[PDB]
Structure formats: structure tokens, C-alpha cells
């Protein structure tokens, strides 16, 4: 970047909020995945929405790419500055506003994480359920279309984002559902909110998200259940869903993942393919759900439930840290993850096949998943200097993605496309789907400067 351009950035946000230092740029050139660090030319921290708009306008009109940056916990290289440009770290805008506990809604700026929001909501009787394992920006979660362990019951970001405030690439300010609006449903015009959820910073910069809040459960019971095989655990999952048990959380760990989590969190669960389960309701409904769910797990050889506030917190903290538990198996490694989501009846085939394919390869892989959604991840751990292994991991990852597509599924349930799944997306939606998404990208970002090289 030219000195005049850097000075123009400083005129918007203040000198302390622009950095061209190599170390600062490198820290903002990668996320939590193995995608190689590609440092932006500068990092900028806008202090309010007017500054976001003015930074975007400056970059856009000068032909400088823009990379929105939340907490950098993505796993598909979304923040990697493949074409250089200006990384906009949005986290200094960290206010919670418009808390409407009678309407079950709240507005959050990009610096607000789920942990911050739920802390703010203590003693309100309400909580925000969508729970990625990382302490991520809620606006970043809206940008990636995130889900979590609670999504099976409480919905994904797509289900729980009611409105978005978006700085469009040329600086215009859009409130997708209208400024200040919040409501349960609408047929008014075209739904713009859903277009920006899962847009990954390629259509605009989310500067606030209006979120649906949920009532805290009357009572909570968590447990683990060990199974003799992956087949038995996944058949149990499908049967629980087909029986319509309204489970709050149903998470799968294969034996490799279970052992990794044991070693990383001081859990002592039997090393086996395992379901972590949670149930919400009254004492009467809990007993009913438990009895129907234990009957199904027993049919498939599940252990008697190992019951788990502080043990439950310990259980879910270990699950939330599964990514790092995997990484700890091979110190110094980075990881790539698959994220397929298939029709639930096909989940047994593809999980068992994935386990068999991992075993037949020399690759280390841990399997963990939001199986209540028909979704799972294979975390594939790689030596950053071993080029040949990564090609095998990439090849394994595409082949699994294509297998999910053959089953009528999707290549990503929650993580997004970023740099890693662009070819899979083309196969998933075909030429008319690709052209339609690209036309939408072009009307919002004519110059192609809004996080270039990602998604499409």
C-alpha cells in the first residue's frame, strides 16, 4: 500500500488503529486451519460503523481488497489475504444493545462473543444457544453460518439471526430486515437476512446481528454412552431422531476422538465410540425422554448412561475443545477438517465408511460430530512441512466431500467454503447455481474486492 493510502486509513480510524507491521499482519493472515498464512498489507480496527463505512469506501474505490476479520477462529482460510489488501478487525465494536427480553431478542456488535452475551444475560432467564467450541465473534458466526452442539434442538445461526446490519463493499449501510426491526416471521419482500448469513465476508461487513434468545431450560441432564462400534452409535442416533426425542445435544466421538479428549481435558471416559447427550425439560418430560432414549441406545449395545453443573460444564468444555485435543495428538501439527452433512438415513453408511477409509490410510484422523443434524467432522492432522501427507489429506477430504454429495448431502454443514471447498461447491449446486450465486456476488461487490478468492 502507498503511504498516502495508509495515511487516509489513519485519518478515518486514528493512527493507533492502523498497522502495517509485519508481525501484526501475519497474526491476521491465517485462522485456525492449515491454510497457509497470507498476510494482509495492513490491519485496521474501526471504532464505529461510520468508520467501517469510510474504510470500506476508501478501499473499494482505490481497488484495495477488504478482508473482514472477527476472532480468526474459522477453519477454511476465510481471513487469508490471498490478494493482499486491508484486513478489517471488527472486534473493538463490542457493545450489546437493544436487549428486548420480552421479545427474546438482542443486538450485538462484532466484538461480542457468545460467552460475553450469555454472561450479560445471567439472571435474565434467557440464553443464546448456538455454541461453536471456540469463543467466536457472534457476527463472525453469522458470517459463516455457524451451528453448534445445541443446534439440533435450538437451531443454527440461520434459524436464530433475525436481522443484520451490513456495510456493503462500497460503504453503504444496509439493515437487511429494516433498521431496528425484530419479529418472528415476515413475508415482506425478498428475505435479505438469509443471503448475508453464510456469506463469509464476500458480500459485505456485518457490523451488528440481531439474535433470537431462548428461555433457559427448566432442568438439564447430561450423560455419556459408550458403544461397541461406530455403527451402533450412529444407528442409535438415527433411531433417536426418527423417534422424535427432542434431545438438546447429541454429539458423536469415535474412539480416537474420545481418547484425544481424555488426554486433553482429564476426562476418563471409556475409550470407545461415544455419544455425549443432553436433555432439557421438566422432571416429567426428562424422565420420559431418558426412558425412550435409553431404550434405543440399549437396543444397539449402548452402556448405561454415565451421568453428569460442574461435571456437565467439564463434559461440554472437552467437547468444545475437540479441535485442540485432536491437534495435541501430534504436537506441532495443523489440521484440516471435513464437515459433510447428509440425509440422516445415510449417516450410518458414510460414518462407517469414513472410519474404514481412515483405517485403510496412513492418515491420523479423529471423528467428532453434530450427528443430530446428520453432520460430522473428520479432523485430519498434518505436519506443516510434510507436503506429501497434506496432498493425501486433501485427497481424502475431497473424496469424503464427493461421497456426501453422491448421497444427496452438502459438503459443509457449518464451517463454510472459504478456500478449501470451492470445487466441491461447484459440484454441489451445478452451473446454474454457481452463476446465480456469482450474479448476486457481482451486484453487491461489482469490483470483486470483498474478500476475494473465497467461496466462489
Ligand X SMILES: Cc1cc2nc3c(=O)[nH]c(=O)nc-3n(C[C@H](O)[C@H](O)[C@H](O)COP(=O)(O)OP(=O)(O)OC[C@H]3O[C@@H](n4cnc5c(N)ncnc54)[C@H](O)[C@@H]3O)c2cc1C
How near is the Cβ of 414 to ligand X at its closest, in Å? 3
Phi/psi at 376 (5° precision) = -155, 160
From CA 194, how far away is CA 212, in angstroms rounded? 14
- Residue selected from 12, 25, 32, 420 as contacting ligand X according to rule CB under 6 A: 32
Helix axes 283-299, 230-242, angle to 10 degrees: 140
Residue holding cell 490491519?
43
The closest alpha carbon to 397, from 357, 359, 370, belongs to 357
From CA 203, how far away is CA 448, in angstroms rounded? 9
**In DSSP terms, which residues pair with 174 in a beta bridge?**
166
Q: Which stretch binds ligand X (CB under 6 A): 73-81, 214-222, 268-276, 350-358?
A: 73-81
Interface with ligand X, residue 56, by CB under 6 A: no
Interface with ligand X, residue 415, by CB under 6 A: yes
DSSP assignment, residue 236?
Answer: H
Q: Which stretch binds ligand X (CB under 6 A): 39-47, 66-74, 358-366, 431-439?
A: 66-74
How near is the Cβ of 327 to ligand X at its closest, in Å? 9
Interaction mask 148-167, ligand X, x per CB under 6 A? x-------------------
Contacts with ligand X by CB under 6 A: the residue count is: 38
DSSP assignment, residue 338?
Answer: -
For ligand X, the closer of residues 143 and 290 by Cβ is: 143
The closest alpha carbon to 117, from 135, 91, 90, 133, belongs to 135
Interface with ligand X, residue 55, by CB under 6 A: no
**430-455 in b/e burial notation, b at 16+ Cβ within 10 A?**
eeeebeebeeebeebbeebbbbbbbb
Interface with ligand X, residue 451, by CB under 6 A: yes
Q: What SS3 state is found at 116?
A: helix
Interface with ligand X, residue 205, by CB under 6 A: yes
Interface with ligand X, residue 137, by CB under 6 A: yes
How near is the Cβ of 300 to ligand X at its closest, in Å? 25
How near is the Cβ of 189 to ligand X at its closest, in Å? 22
- Extract the runs of DSSP E, i.e. beta strands, from 324-376: 334-337, 365-369
DSSP assignment, residue 410?
Answer: B
Interface with ligand X, residue 68, by CB under 6 A: yes
Interface with ligand X, residue 73, by CB under 6 A: yes
How near is the Cβ of 430 to ligand X at its closest, in Å? 24
**337-356 in b/e burial notation, b at 16+ Cβ within 10 A?**
bbbbbbebebbbebbeebbe
Residue 345 neighbours by CB under 8 Å, 6+ apart: 238
- Residue selected from 109, 165, 200, 278 as contacting ligand X according to rule CB under 6 A: 200
How near is the Cβ of 275 to ligand X at its closest, in Å? 16
Interface with ligand X, residue 354, by CB under 6 A: no
Interaction mask 312-331, ligand X, x per CB under 6 A? -----------xx-------
Interface with ligand X, residue 251, by CB under 6 A: no
Interface with ligand X, residue 417, by CB under 6 A: no
Interface with ligand X, residue 127, by CB under 6 A: no
Interface with ligand X, residue 198, by CB under 6 A: no
From CA 133, how far away is CA 122, in angstroms rounded? 20
Helix axes 310-320, 255-265, angle to 10 degrees: 120
- Residue selected from 139, 161, 230, 315 as contacting ligand X according to rule CB under 6 A: 139
Interface with ligand X, residue 169, by CB under 6 A: no
Which residues here bind ligand X, judged by CB under 6 A? 31-32, 67-75, 78-79, 90, 110, 132-134, 136-137, 139-141, 143-144, 146-148, 200-201, 205-206, 323-324, 414-415, 451, 454
Amino acid at each position: 500500500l502507498s503511504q498516502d493510502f495508509v495515511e487516509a486509513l489513519k485519518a478515518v480510524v486514528g493512527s493507533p488503529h492502523v498497522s502495517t507491521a509485519s508481525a501484526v499482519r501475519e497474526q491476521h493472515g491465517h485462522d485456525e486451519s492449515m491454510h497457509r498464512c497470507q498476510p494482509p498489507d495492513a490491519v485496521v480496527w474501526p471504532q464505529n460503523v461510520d468508520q467501517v463505512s469510510r474504510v470500506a469506501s476508501l478501499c473499494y474505490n482505490q481497488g484495495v481488497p477488504i478482508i473482514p476479520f472477527g476472532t480468526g477462529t474459522g477453519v477454511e482460510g476465510g481471513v487469508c489475504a490471498v490478494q493482499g489488501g486491508v484486513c478489517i478487525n471488527l472486534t473493538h465494536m463490542d457493545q450489546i444493545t437493544e436487549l428486548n427480553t420480552e421479545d427474546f431478542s438482542v443486538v450485538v456488535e462484532p466484538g461480542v462473543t457468545r460467552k460475553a452475551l450469555n454472561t450479560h444475560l445471567r439472571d435474565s432467564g434467557l440464553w443464546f444457544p448456538v455454541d461453536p467450541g471456540a469463543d467466536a465473534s457472534l457476527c463472525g458466526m453469522a458470517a459463516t453460518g455457524a451451528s453448534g452442539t445445541n443446534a439440533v434442538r435450538y437451531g443454527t445461526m440461520r434459524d436464530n439471526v433475525i436481522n443484520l446490519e451490513v456495510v456493503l463493499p462500497d460503504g453503504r449501510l444496509l439493515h437487511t430486515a429494516g433498521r431496528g426491526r425484530h419479529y418472528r416471521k415476515s413475508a415482506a419482500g425478498y428475505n435479505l437476512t438469509g443471503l448475508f448469513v453464510g456469506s463469509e465476508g464476500t458480500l459485505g461487513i456485518i457490523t451488528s446481528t440481531t439474535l433470537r434468545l431462548h428461555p433457559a431450560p427448566e432442568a438439564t441432564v447430561a450423560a455419556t454412552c459408550a458403544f461397541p462400534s461406530v455403527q451402533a452409535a450412529v444407528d442409535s442416533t438415527v433411531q433417536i431422531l426418527q423417534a422424535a426425542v427432542p434431545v438438546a445435544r447429541i454429539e458423536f466421538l469415535d474412539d480416537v476422538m474420545m481418547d484425544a479428549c481424555n488426554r486433553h481435558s482429564k476426562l476418563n471416559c471409556p475409550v470407545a465410540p461415544t455419544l455425549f447427550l443432553e436433555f432439557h425439560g421438566s422432571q416429567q418430560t426428562l424422565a420420559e425422554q431418558l426412558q425412550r432414549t435409553e431404550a434405543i441406545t440399549q437396543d444397539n449395545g449402548g452402556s448405561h448412561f454415565s451421568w453428569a453443573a460442574e461435571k456437565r460444564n467439564e463434559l461440554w468444555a472437552a467437547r468444545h475443545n475437540a479441535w485442540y485435543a485432536a491437534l495435541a495428538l501430534s504436537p506441532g501439527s495443523k489440521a484440516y477438517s471435513t464437515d459433510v452433512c447428509v440425509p440422516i438415513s445415510r449417516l450410518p453408511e458414510i460414518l462407517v465408511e469414513t472410519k474404514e477409509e481412515i483405517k485403510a490410510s496412513k492418515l491420523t484422523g479423529a471423528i467428532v460430530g453434530h450427528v443430530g443434524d446428520g453432520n460430522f467432522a473428520c479432523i485430519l492432522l498434518v505436519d506443516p512441512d510434510d507436503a506429501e501427507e497434506q496432498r493425501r489429506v486433501k485427497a481424502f477430504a475431497e473424496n469424503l466431500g464427493r461421497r456426501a454429495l453422491a448421497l444427496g448431502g452438502t459438503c459443509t454443514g457449518e464451517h463454510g467454503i472459504g478456500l478449501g471447498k470451492r470445487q466441491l461447491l461447484q459440484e454441489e449446486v451445478g452451473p446454474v447455481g454457481v452463476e446465480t450465486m456469482r450474479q448476486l456476488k457481482n451486484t453487491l461487490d461489482p469490483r470483486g474486492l470483498m474478500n476475494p478468492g473465497k467461496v466462489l
